[PDB]
């Protein structure tokens, strides 16, 4: 499916704040009628990848919530059709085997399963276990690494048959060469013709994206292509692309460089 937003604004509503916590004073934001997002525009064709970045707490997750229908649009038009599949920043794990987690509530299909496992780089993980993907997890999958939890949880969202995929910051952990391989095999190849939104703080993702959205303080700091970012926001670009190996900084450091740059060049 394509997705279009045309001058969309959404305000804090009661209970929105608690959802954001689950997924990543509220009453005062609700009472004062503040925008969570203000004047958003995007137009993503069927099969394109939109990369969303910005400062911390800039409204990245809330934008996905609008798509999901968990946040309501007070003004403006949003258009998108079909099933959506959402991979939260929080990597949830249910009681049962790794395989059961990846096909949770959906039916097993062999070619599809093996293909998602491979592209999400799960094969290197399961091979460390005596029962491989029949290994039993407790709820939360607490003895795994963050990257292992995020890969199973991404594999579950991607195995889902959907017209639109929302992937909220899966590439945030220390095993950064693995994440580079997941970006390439899963997001770029396996899902190359699935419409998809990727929230990210890595510049390679902006470079490979069909469209880019950068958010700051609830506002659209930039929407366009990567070529248009270099030309129309040269201040921002030169600072970020000027790093040697930005994408291998910790996520906290990458998000802090982005915030500061965004505060700078308003």
UniProtKB/Swiss-Prot annotation:
User: For the ABC transporter domain, which residue ranges apply?
Assistant: 25-242
Annotated ATP 1 binding sites: 12, 54-61, 89
**Coiled coil: which residue ranges?**
none
Subcellular location field: Apical cell membrane; Early endosome membrane; Cell membrane; Recycling endosome membrane
Using the record's annotations, give every residue carrying the modification Phosphoserine: 145, 256, 266
Lipidated positions (S-palmitoyl cysteine) are 120
Domain comment from the record reads as follows: Binds and hydrolyzes ATP via the two cytoplasmic ABC transporter nucleotide-binding domains. The two ATP-binding domains interact with each other, forming a head-to-tail dimer. Normal ATPase activity requires interaction between the two domains. The first ABC transporter nucleotide-binding domain has no ATPase activity by itself.
Family note: Belongs to the ABC transporter superfamily. ABCC family. CFTR transporter (TC 3.A.1.202) subfamily.
Q: What does this protein do?
A: Epithelial ion channel that plays an important role in the regulation of epithelial ion and water transport and fluid homeostasis. Mediates the transport of chloride ions across the cell membrane. Possesses an intrinsic ATPase activity and utilizes ATP to gate its channel; the passive flow of anions through the channel is gated by cycles of ATP binding and hydrolysis by the ATP-binding domains. The ion channel is also permeable to HCO(3)(-); selectivity depends on the extracellular chloride concentration.
Its name, as the record gives it, is Cystic fibrosis transmembrane conductance regulator
Species, as recorded: Mus musculus (Mouse)
| Gene name of the record | Cftr
């Amino acid at each position: 499916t394509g997705i279009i937003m045309e001058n969309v604004t959404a305000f804090w509503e009661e209970g929105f704040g608690e959802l954001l916590e689950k997924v990543q004073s509220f009453s005062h934001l609700c009472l004062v009628g503040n925008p969570v997002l203000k004047n958003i525009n995007l137009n993503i064709e069927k099969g394109e990848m939109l990369a969303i970045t910005g400062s911390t707490g800039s409204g990245k997750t809330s934008l996905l919530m609008l798509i999901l229908g968990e946040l309501e649009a007070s003004e403006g038009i949003i258009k998108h059709s079909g099933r959506v599949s959402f991979c939260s920043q929080f990597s949830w794990i249910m009681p049962g085997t790794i395989k059961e987690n990846i096909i949770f509530g959906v039916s097993y299909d062999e070619y599809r399963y093996k293909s998602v496992v491979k592209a999400c780089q799960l094969q290197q993980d399961i091979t460390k276990f005596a029962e491989q993907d029949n290994t039993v997890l407790g709820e939360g999958g607490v003895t795994l690494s963050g990257g292992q939890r995020a890969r199973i949880s991404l594999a579950r969202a991607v195995y889902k048959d959907a017209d639109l995929y929302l992937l909220d910051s899966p590439f945030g952990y220390l095993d950064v060469f693995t994440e580079e391989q997941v970006f390439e095999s899963c997001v770029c190849k396996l899902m190359a013709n699935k419409t998809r939104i990727l929230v990210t703080s890595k510049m390679e993702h902006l470079r490979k994206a069909d469209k880019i959205l950068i958010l700051h303080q609830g506002s659209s700091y930039f929407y366009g292509t990567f070529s248009e970012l270099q030309s129309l926001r040269p201040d921002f670009s030169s600072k970020l692309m000027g790093y040697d190996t930005f994408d291998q900084f910790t996520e906290e450091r990458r998000s802090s460089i982005l915030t500061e740059t965004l505060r700078r060049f308003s």
